[PDB]
């Protein structure tokens, strides 16, 4: 290993933000074997991707165009604009033209080596190339909306080179004898302030969040070292331990309640039976009383402080669990009537509807019948029992003859639902993946967040998923960009899934390319920068007492020194990073008058071709773990998505927002918007006699001409029912006032989601959004009407997608949340999508949501201001 070797794994653990050679916080050699097998993956990857489409990333989609765009265009045209120097010219072309077919009929026009020039948006690093109508590419189906002319650069396309990529005994199945474990003790430093607990040891062999045996030890004092030296032995035989399983360790507190959990895979990533003597670290629970967090095996570094588990397993030779192999029957594609109608029901059923035994024993023993219905896969496989060596060989039988499953629509909703915890094997998560295959970049970018997610419920390091990911992110730049912030945010964030994504990020910066990590370089330098300049300025992280202006002025000095020569003088926006931002805006970068004291900073544009001088506003948030609002955020672009298949514009507001790295992040300053709270204020004050007309008289006075106004109001009508639906299908509609914005432009959007018997709402929908609508008392009007019919069909066609509404929130309480989630929380969106009911009580049920809002008009708000303001 010389120096360069050695030099190049340091950048990279300084960009992943942690070392992935660390060995300090394992017990076998996982990790690093999947470091080394994701070798010849990422090779592969980078070998067959295209060096010239590779470097140009173009953003495209073979979606159609939405009925709301198809009015936009007027006969199959469209009008772009092409600069030069100052030398610019305006083209009307083809809605099916090719970038090529373009630039060729762009020589023969303007007239007075050849085809060298490539096509770029101004001011930003987003090309239109490739052979793909112009239609497709998601710029111009951007401007097309929002109504904005497409202006386009000719310059000389990015030279492939830069993307250059570093120089690169045996027993089986047969052991009928029972599991066991033998529980030697516990040890903790320090120990609780009660001390007359008692804890006992409660050792699970688990599958698919599902226990199949249970056993436990006696209480004893609560102690800072508790011996027991007692043998657990289970009902289940080593040859029925299917491949996954884990033996969940955990201890509970009682007087004389979960507390401490690790587990640890029974068979290994080699198929060798875990044996042995060993020490864990555990976990200590949160919430006193579920999640992704508990199915780790990882252990806790923190060796010092927390409660560690010293247990022995048996230790002979080395039985190995044997990879099954296909042979082939009953196939029985007959049943009686009532039989079939009955199956038909359960399979129809809800994803959180649970299987009765009588439920699972007709599924399993019409395996095959089941098998013509990719929608029952996951009630099927869920009726499987796996903790059966004959049954789990049948299960694989059965996959065998996927041709009904290969053929099959991909389903996105129906693939998370064999990727969540209930499922385990390998073989049903890989038949998954399998489908996800097919999913264009544009529709990976939508689900992106998820998948890297759902990694968390994946018992190996490496797996089909990962590796999904890997290459996915590997053949496309702005997927790459994504992939790096969310395991990046995860890796900082999480210590019970840091060293798996570790991993498997490093597989991935080290096929990006040198460009890309220089990339990435500048940005991390930026934040690490910011970072510490939140840390140097003490009072930042002191929410007792406001801002003056003695830290603002040490804020811009700060930034001052940096910006001379230490400051990258451009790096792409993490969250936008088509956007390339340059230099600081000193002047007008200041310190948030809010209570944590967020950095409020802008940037100049660092390329000179935008058009505008607009700058680029950037808050720098500190002290505040900001997964949940990109959850929150991106669930919001899948809806858009959802009602973009369902044709139609909600006009949400899903505005930038990245975690990049431990409790900060960097997000999208909106322009010429302000809170709803503060419209109110300004007339008003700091009381809760709100009025009714404030919003409007707001609008109106920044809207002066008529056919600006109607657009604004008509705008607001569609952003305020995409938000009612959209919060209240999530369960977060009840918010005060100050944690939603509106811009000059009548868009209303939600903001600030953080970790989100009294009066209570379904959303927000209060008398001065009602009044803007043209509605002051209980009668209704126009644009209310309008509203009441967007909700609705918002509404529904929502519900067309329920099964995938469902996964996509059961995942995102399960893995976005600190504390552990229960089957009542996960119900909540099965009541709020009226599973079961028809369209039209569907329909009446939202109406009646609208009809609450109206009947307690200001009263909420009163009180979140009591609340939040006075601290009633
Ligand atoms: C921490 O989520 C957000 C914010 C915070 C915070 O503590 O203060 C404010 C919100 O105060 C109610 C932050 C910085 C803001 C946003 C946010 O999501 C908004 C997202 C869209 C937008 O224009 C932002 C950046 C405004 C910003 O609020 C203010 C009052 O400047």
């Known amino acids: 290993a010389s120096e360069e070797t050695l030099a190049f794994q340091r950048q990279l653990n300084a960009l992943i933000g942690y070392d992935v050679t660390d060995v300090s916080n394992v017990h076998d050699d996982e990790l690093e074997f999947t470091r080394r097998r994701l070798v010849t993956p990422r090779m592969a ?41 100052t030398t610019s010219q305006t083209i009307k072309v083809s809605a099916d033209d090719t970038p090529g077919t373009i630039l060729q009929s762009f020589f023969t026009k303007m007239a007075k080596n050849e085809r060298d020039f490539v096509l770029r948006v101004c001011g930003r690093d987003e090309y239109l190339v490739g052979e793909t109508p112009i239609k497709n590419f998601q710029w111009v189906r951007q401007c097309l909306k929002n109504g904005e002319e497409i202006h386009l650069v000719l310059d000389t396309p990015p030279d492939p080179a830069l993307d250059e990529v570093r120089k690169e005994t045996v027993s089986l199945w047969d052991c009928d004898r029972k599991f066991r474990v033998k529980i030697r003790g516990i040890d903790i430093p320090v120990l609780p302030r009660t001390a007359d607990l008692t804890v006992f040891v409660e050792a699970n062999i688990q599958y698919g969040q599902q226990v199949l045996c249970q056993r436990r030890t006696s209480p004893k004092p609560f102690t800072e070292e508790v011996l027991w030296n007692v043998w657990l032995e289970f009902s289940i035989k080593i040859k029925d331990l299917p491949k996954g399983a884990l033996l969940n360790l955990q201890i509970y507190c009682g007087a004389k309640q979960l507390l401490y959990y690790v587990n640890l895979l029974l068979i290994d990533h080699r198929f060798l039976l875990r044996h042995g003597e060993y020490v864990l670290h555990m976990w200590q629970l949160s919430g006193k009383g579920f999640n992704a967090d508990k199915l780790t095996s990882a252990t806790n570094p923190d060796k010092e402080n927390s409660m560690s588990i010293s247990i022995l397993l048996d230790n002979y030779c080395h039985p190995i669990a044997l990879p099954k192999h296909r ?219 406001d801002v003056s202006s003695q830290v603002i002025s040490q804020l811009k000095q700060k930034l001052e020194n940096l910006q001379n020569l230490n400051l990258p003088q451009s790096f792409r926006v993490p969250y936008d990073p088509g956007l390339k931002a340059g230099a600081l805006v000193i002047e007008k970068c200041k310190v948030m008058a809010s209570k944590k004291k967020p950095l409020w900073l802008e940037f100049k544009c660092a390329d000179p071709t935008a058009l505008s001088n607009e700058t680029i506003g950037i808050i720098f948030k500190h002290g505040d773990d900001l997964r949940q609002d990109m959850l929150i955020l991106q669930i919001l672009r899948i809806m858009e998505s959802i009602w973009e298949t369902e044709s139609l514009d909600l006009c949400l507001l899903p505005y930038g927002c990245i975690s990049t790295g431990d409790k900060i992040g960097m997000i999208e300053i909106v322009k010429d918007a302000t809170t709803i709270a503060k419209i109110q204020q300004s007339t008003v004050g700091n009381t809760g006699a709100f009025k009714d007309e404030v919003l409007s008289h707001w609008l109106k006075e920044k809207c002066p001409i008529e056919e600006k106004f109607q657009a604004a109001v008509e705008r607001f009508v569609y952003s305020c029912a995409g938000y009612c639906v959209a919060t209240f299908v999530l369960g977060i509609g009840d918010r005060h006032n100050d944690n939603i914005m509106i811009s000059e432009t009548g868009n209303l959007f939600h903001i600030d989601f953080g970790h989100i018997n009294k009066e209570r709402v379904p959303f927000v929908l209060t008398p001065d959004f009602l009044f803007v609508m043209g509605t002051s008392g209980k009668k209704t009007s126009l644009h209310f009407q309008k509203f009441q019919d967007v909700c609705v069909k918002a509404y529904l066609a929502l519900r067309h997608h329920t099964n995938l509404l469902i996964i996509l929130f059961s995942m995102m309480l399960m893995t976005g949340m600190p504390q552990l989630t229960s089957k009542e929380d996960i119900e909540y969106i099965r009541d709020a999508l009226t599973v079961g009911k028809s369209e039209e009580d569907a329909k009446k049920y939202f109406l009646d949501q609208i009809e609450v809002c109206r009947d307690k008009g200001w009263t909420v708000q009163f009180n979140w201001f009591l609340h939040l303001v006075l601290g009633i």
Not at 49 to 71: G, Q
Not at 496 to 513: M, P, W
């Open 45 to 85: 990857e980078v070998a067959g991707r295209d060096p010239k489409l590779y470097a140009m990333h173009p953003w495209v989609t073979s979606k159609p165009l939405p009925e709301y765009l198809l009015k936009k265009i007027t006969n199959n045209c469209v009008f772009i604009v092409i600069h030069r120097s």
């Open 327 to 545: 042979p082939t029957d009953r196939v029985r594609a007959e049943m009686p009537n009532q039989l079939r109608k009955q199956l038909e029901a359960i399979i129809a059923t809800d994803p959180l509807n649970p299987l009765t035994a009588e439920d699972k024993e007709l599924l399993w023993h019409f395996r095959y019948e089941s098998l013509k219905d990719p929608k029952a896969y996951p009630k099927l496989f869920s009726s499987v029992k796996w903790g059966q060596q004959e049954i789990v060989a049948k299960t694989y039988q059965l996959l065998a003859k996927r041709e009904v499953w290969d053929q099959s629509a991909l389903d996105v909703g129906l693939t998370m639902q064999l990727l969540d915890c209930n499922f385990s094997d390998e073989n049903v998560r890989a038949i998954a993946v399998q489908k996800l295959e097919s999913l264009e970049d544009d529709d990976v970018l939508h689900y992106l967040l998820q998948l890297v997610q759902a990694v968390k419920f994946e018992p190996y390091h490496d797996s089909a998923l990962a590796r999904f990911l890997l290459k996915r992110g590997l053949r496309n730049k702005r997927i790459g960009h994504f992939l790096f912030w969310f395991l990046r945010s995860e890796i900082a964030q999480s210590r019970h899934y840091q060293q798996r994504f570790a991993v498997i990020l490093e597989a991935y910066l080290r096929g990006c390319g040198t460009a890309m990590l220089h990339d990435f370089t500048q940005q991390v330098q930026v934040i690490d920068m910011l970072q510490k300049v939140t840390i140097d300025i003490k009072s930042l992280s002191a929410e007792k007492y």
